[PDB]
């Protein structure tokens, strides 16, 4: 969960969907995330990091898949900040 808060802050909100597209989650589910709760953008972005752990069958390394997305988006600096959150 703490890593999810880091990804929500380190990753930009406006381009979050693009970051989500790099995540590989169903594109249509991404649009539905706003319906789940758009009153709180952090809750929406958190929905991706939270719903992903639930909907995706990833037993562990949830940030790992996200980290690879960061590297593709040149967000390695952000992962280091997110990594600091875990530490």
UniProtKB/Swiss-Prot annotation:
Glycans are attached at residue 21. The soluble form is produced from the membrane form by proteolytic processing. Residues 1-86 form the Death domain. It comes from the Eukaryota. It is found in: Cell membrane; Golgi apparatus membrane; Secreted. Binding of TNF to the extracellular domain leads to homotrimerization. The aggregated death domains provide a novel molecular interface that interacts specifically with the death domain of TRADD. Various TRADD-interacting proteins such as TRAFS, RIPK1 and possibly FADD, are recruited to the complex by their association with TRADD. This complex activates at least two distinct signaling cascades, apoptosis and NF-kappa-B signaling. Interacts with BAG4, BABAM2, FEM1B, GRB2, SQSTM1 and TRPC4AP. Interacts directly with NOL3 (via CARD domain); inhibits TNF-signaling pathway. (Microbial infection) Interacts with mumps virus protein SH; this interaction inhibits downstream NF-kappa-B pathway activation. It is linked to Periodic fever, familial, autosomal dominant: A hereditary periodic fever syndrome characterized by recurrent fever, abdominal pain, localized tender skin lesions and myalgia. Reactive amyloidosis is the main complication and occurs in 25% of cases. The domain that induces A-SMASE is probably identical to the death domain. The N-SMASE activation domain (NSD) is both necessary and sufficient for activation of N-SMASE. Receptor for TNFSF2/TNF-alpha and homotrimeric TNFSF1/lymphotoxin-alpha. The adapter molecule FADD recruits caspase-8 to the activated receptor. The resulting death-inducing signaling complex (DISC) performs caspase-8 proteolytic activation which initiates the subsequent cascade of caspases (aspartate-specific cysteine proteases) mediating apoptosis. Contributes to the induction of non-cytocidal TNF effects including anti-viral state and activation of the acid sphingomyelinase. This is Tumor necrosis factor receptor superfamily member 1A. The gene is TNFRSF1A.
């Amino acid at each position: 969960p703490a890593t999810l808060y880091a990804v929500v802050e380190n990753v930009p909100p406006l381009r979050w969907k693009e970051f989500v597209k790099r995540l590989g989650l169903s594109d249509h589910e991404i649009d539905r995330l706003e319906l789940q709760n758009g009153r709180c953008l952090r809750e929406a972005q958190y929905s991706m990091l939270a719903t992903w752990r639930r909907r995706t069958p990833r037993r562990e390394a949830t940030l790992e898949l996200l980290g690879r997305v960061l590297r593709d988006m040149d967000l390695l600096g952000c992962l280091e900040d997110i990594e600091e959150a875990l530490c």
